[PDB]
């Protein structure tokens, strides 16, 4: 994927109203209406739009878009960077949430979800889960056959593809 390719993919990723919303904030820092903003303001517009790049990340993006020394970033490149940051931030939040789900599932905090903990959480959902269904989920997620689900196995169980 080239940058035009990446740009089309970034646009495909977003709804048109979100793209417009992002351009409204972006344009507040254009002024000159060139379709670009100073790379100095990139962090500020990304943060106004709920993203949280690190300073190192910003320096990396800036260096990636500013190889000609213009000191600016255009809106299309901006959208590629925003989508990269969204995917990154979303992933981090998911990881965080799964870690929290695991310590809640593991009621006795021994670092594992056993079939009784698995059984109690699944029944607590109100679903008509049978013991056989719970046993089937345990068997299929317990990769090393020790009868319990540790955090690595839980991440695989939950993320599924994983
Ligand atoms: Tb446990
Ligand atoms: Tb296991």
């Amino acid at each position: 994927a080239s940058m035009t390719d990446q740009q089309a993919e970034a646009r495909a990723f977003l709804s048109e109203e979100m793209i417009a919303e992002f351009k409204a904030a972006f344009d507040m820092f254009d002024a000159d209406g060139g379709g670009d903003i100073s790379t100095k303001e990139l962090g500020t517009v990304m943060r106004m739009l709920g993203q949280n790049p690190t300073k190192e990340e910003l320096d990396a993006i800036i260096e990636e878009v500013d190889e000609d020394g213009s000191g600016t970033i255009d809106f299309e490149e901006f959208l590629v960077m925003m989508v990269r940051q969204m995917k990154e931030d979303a992933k981090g939040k998911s990881e965080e949430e799964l870690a929290n789900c695991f310590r809640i599932f593991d009621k006795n905090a021994d670092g594992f979800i056993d079939i009784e903990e698995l059984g109690e959480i699944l029944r607590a959902t109100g679903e008509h889960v049978t013991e056989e269904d719970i046993e089937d989920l345990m068997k299929d997620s317990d990769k090393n056959n020790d009868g319990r689900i540790d955090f690595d196995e839980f991440l695989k169980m939950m993320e599924g593809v994983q």
Side-chain angles (χ1 to χ4, degrees), residues 105-114 117:
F105 256 104
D106 178 24
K107 309 181 196 58
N108 72 345
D110 66 344
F112 305 91
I113 301 169
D114 52 45
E117 284 166 333

Side-chain angles (χ1 to χ4, degrees), residues 112 141-150 153:
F112 305 91
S141 311
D142 180 27
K143 276 23 208 133
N144 68 343
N145 299 297
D146 63 356
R148 53 225 181 192
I149 297 165
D150 57 26
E153 291 170 332

Side-chain angles (χ1 to χ4, degrees), residues 38-55:
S38 169
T39 44
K40 298 302 131 132
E41 294 307 322
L42 179 57
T44 305
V45 189
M46 288 179 89
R47 284 175 215 117
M48 282 173 62
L49 292 173
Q51 299 312 131
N52 46 270
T54 60
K55 273 44 161 178

